[PDB]
């Protein structure tokens with residue numbers, strides 16, 4: 333549409349990821365690969381607010397972006413992910429979080445949003461783009477038979493609504509998470525998904541700051557596949573552009589001129605999974621298309637890197653309380669540490685297998 337949030341802005345590079353990358357490049361023995369690994373810190377990524385402990389860090393990022401803009405005569409943009417719902421990750425085990433519905437989860441989540449809003453309010457010269465709660469809404473479309481998800485439904489919707497309503501008041505551009513082609517792209521799931529997204533958008537007042545949806549977050553699908561990956565058999569929507577082209581018209585019909593952003597951070601290498609539902613630390617993944625607003629689709633505002641490559645998806649250690657057997661499958665890189673922590677050997681392969689090369 334007419335207002336692409338990235339036009340005319342310089343993206344503030346994540347200091348969190350830059351520090352991880354700088355440390356990781358020092359441990360890569362090949363000198364040519366080390367130099368290429370270090371340059372990853374100059375590629376824009378989303379910074380995840382996966383715990384209330386990281387809200388003070390958001391404040392420092394905003395202040396630093398503000399100063400950088402004034403220094404260089406540019407307008408700066410900070411990219412964040414809101415990811416702290418109570419009973420988070422309801423259909424899996426690896427990314428269970430700090431809040432629970434049973435122990436004042438919604439109240440705690442509302443306080444988490446309020447503290448984020450309080451930081452953003454102090455730096456109105458910095459634009460913020462937020463991805464809202466990966467996996468949450470997609471789980472309420474296909475996983476209501478999962479008891480943890482069914483019991484979380486009303487809390488999820490209330491929390492997401494609280495996030496959308498209050499971040500809109502400080503002018504944050506928001507993309508709700510919308511799974512990926514292998515999850516909601518199945519033709520039979522498109523209409524239920526559209527009805528849920530539309531209902532969420534209506535409940536939050538149809539604010540123009542709710543730009544649309546994010547797809548493929550933390551996953552590996554192609555935006556435009558040369559030929560279908562074999563795991564996609566049975567689904568005509570075998571890549572993200574197929575999914576988006578089928579879903580976007582249903583949202584427009586409901587009055588929402590919705591646009592999309594698509595994660596390609598780990599999509600450089602296709603045809604590496606045994607089943608489409610294998611999501612954890614997939615072996616042989618490579619960095620994908622670099623972020624750009626030259627997307628080739630009327631519906632896509634930007635290709636982005638939301639999940640930061642090198643940060644683990646979950647542990648292969650069967651003794652951990654967060655052990656998910658998806659992370660022990662033959663196509664999952666092992667041994668792997670806890671979700672969110674650095675996975676050096678995985679980062680090194682992402683660099684080596686990057687397509688296009690670094």
Ligand SMILES: OC[C@H]1O[C@@H](O[C@H]2[C@H](O)[C@@H](O)[C@@H](O)O[C@@H]2CO)[C@H](O)[C@@H](O)[C@@H]1O
Pocket residue numbers: 421423424427467475512514515548549550551608609610611
């Ligand atoms: O995409 C990353 C998330 O995947 C979630 O699992 C999905 C999977 O992606 C789909 O392909 C299909 O198998 O449904 C699964 C959900 O039941 C996973 O639960 C999340 O933790 C990942 O972030």
Ligand SMILES: OC[C@H]1O[C@@H](O)[C@H](O)[C@@H](O)[C@@H]1O
Pocket residue numbers: 380381382426427639640643644645646671672673
């Ligand atoms: O790497 C980005 C995010 O990935 C998720 O799987 C983890 O649970 C988070 O802790 C992390 O912030």
Ligand code: NA
Pocket residue numbers: 426427550645
């Ligand atoms: Na995950």
